[PDB]
């Protein structure tokens, strides 16, 4: 059934996110040492070592991934057929899903560049 697909996409970001860092769990975001004045500002996603993450890093990554895929699901399931409201609902659907697609890929590109320092 399609509920099995629901189960799998549920499992998707669940084991993209943090099952690897369930036992190696590293707490969410604080690592600044006063930087000049202000003591313990929580920093970010980890950047210097590549393999590590925190809980807050992983969840964000997983969320970015499944929304993109299910945006393509929405492109398939409704935008290619022609049955519903042919000027109001459809245009919304392609609009927000194209927004999903473009801004999602853009921000994930940003969230690999800034933790990664890769030449873009």
């Amino acid at each position: 059934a399609m509920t099995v697909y629901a189960l799998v996409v549920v499992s998707y970001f669940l084991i993209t996110g943090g099952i690897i860092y369930d036992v190696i769990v590293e707490p969410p975001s604080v690592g600044s040492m006063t930087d000049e004045h202000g003591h313990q500002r929580p920093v970010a996603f980890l950047a210097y070592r590549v393999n590590g993450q925190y809980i807050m890093e992983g969840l964000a990554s997983s969320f970015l991934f499944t929304m993109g895929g299910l945006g393509f699901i929405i492109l398939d399931r409704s935008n290619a057929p022609n049955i519903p409201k042919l000027n109001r609902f459809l245009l919304l659907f392609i609009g927000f899903v194209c927004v999903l697609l473009s801004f999602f890929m853009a921000r994930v590109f940003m969230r690999m560049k800034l933790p990664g320092y890769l030449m873009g």
Partner: peptide, 29 residues
């Protein structure tokens, strides 16, 4: 809302908050 600027107006307000929040935090660390 004959016009959509009221929304855009709200977005401008958030940006003013958004940008002006980190804008003073620029000189700090």
């Amino acid at each position: 809302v004959g016009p959509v600027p009221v929304l855009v107006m709200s977005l401008l307000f958030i940006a003013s908050v958004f940008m002006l929040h980190i804008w003073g935090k620029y000189t700090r660390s």
